[PDB]
């Protein structure tokens, strides 16, 4: 999107979100990132929403096809699952490439650096969901490493109710439960995250309280399912 203005790319990403055109949204925000400037808080959210929707559709389709394939065990179901899988891996690789060139290395503030590292953990986690070969373990460790670095920064630099800190802990707990086969670590992280947020709620305004309690409910929903 090299011939489009950065501001036009951002404005069109917002329009694509309104039209529920998430592939367009992602391409516009990919173009905005490749302009080389850092992203604002709002712009980071647009980037994240766009690719979460795109990969979310791919993951949902992959699970449908993987389920059909497992029940069947001609080549068509496997071939088509492989096609969707390859397209999903390409989207994850694209996002990871944006983070590596050069969003993360230019992110100096806690809010931006933790946001991008959480992203990095998430997209390695999506790669891990479909991984089966020689690199499943290496992909899992890449996800863990990104989440862990984000955790370390957020615990040092953000309050326990910060929505990015809470969403990071939520997703890392899902990583532990669903990917790393560590349900006790998942439950422990979710419980400690919830309890430390609850004790900090008194410091918040009405609007910040709503933002934080929304994500604490997601932690509670998982604990209810896991225990």
């Amino acid at each position: 999107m090299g011939s489009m203005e950065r501001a036009s790319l951002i404005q069109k990403a917002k329009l694509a979100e309104q039209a529920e055109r998430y592939e367009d949204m992602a391409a516009f925000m990919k173009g905005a990132v490749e302009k080389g400037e850092e992203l604002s808080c709002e712009e980071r959210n647009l980037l994240s929403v766009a690719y979460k929707n795109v990969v979310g559709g791919q993951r949902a389709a992959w699970r449908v096809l993987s389920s059909i394939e497992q029940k069947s065990n001609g080549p068509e179901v496997r071939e088509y699952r492989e096609k969707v899988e390859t397209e999903l891996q390409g989207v994850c690789d694209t996002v990871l490439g944006l983070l590596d060139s050069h969003l993360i290395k230019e992110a100096g503030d806690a809010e931006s650096r933790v946001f991008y590292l959480k992203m990095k953990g998430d997209y390695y986690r999506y790669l891990a969901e479909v991984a089966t070969g020689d690199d499943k373990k290496r992909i899992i460790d890449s996800a863990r490493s990104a989440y862990q670095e984000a955790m370390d920064i957020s615990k040092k630099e953000m309050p326990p109710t910060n929505p990015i800190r809470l969403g990071l802990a939520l997703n890392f707990s899902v990583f532990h439960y669903e990917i790393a086969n560590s349900p006790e670590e998942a439950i422990s992280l979710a419980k400690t995250t919830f309890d430390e947020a609850m004790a900090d709620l008194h410091t918040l305004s009405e609007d910040s309280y709503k933002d934080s309690t929304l994500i604490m409910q997601l932690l509670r929903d998982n604990l209810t399912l896991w225990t």
């Binding site: 959210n45 647009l46 994240s48 929403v49 979460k52 929707n53 979310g56 998430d122 969403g167 939520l170 997703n171 899902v174 439960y177 669903e178 994500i215 997601l218 929903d221 998982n222 399912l225 896991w226």
Partner: peptide
Amino acid sequence: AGSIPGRRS
């Protein structure tokens, strides 16, 4: 088990 939906905003 739910990650953050993250698909709106």
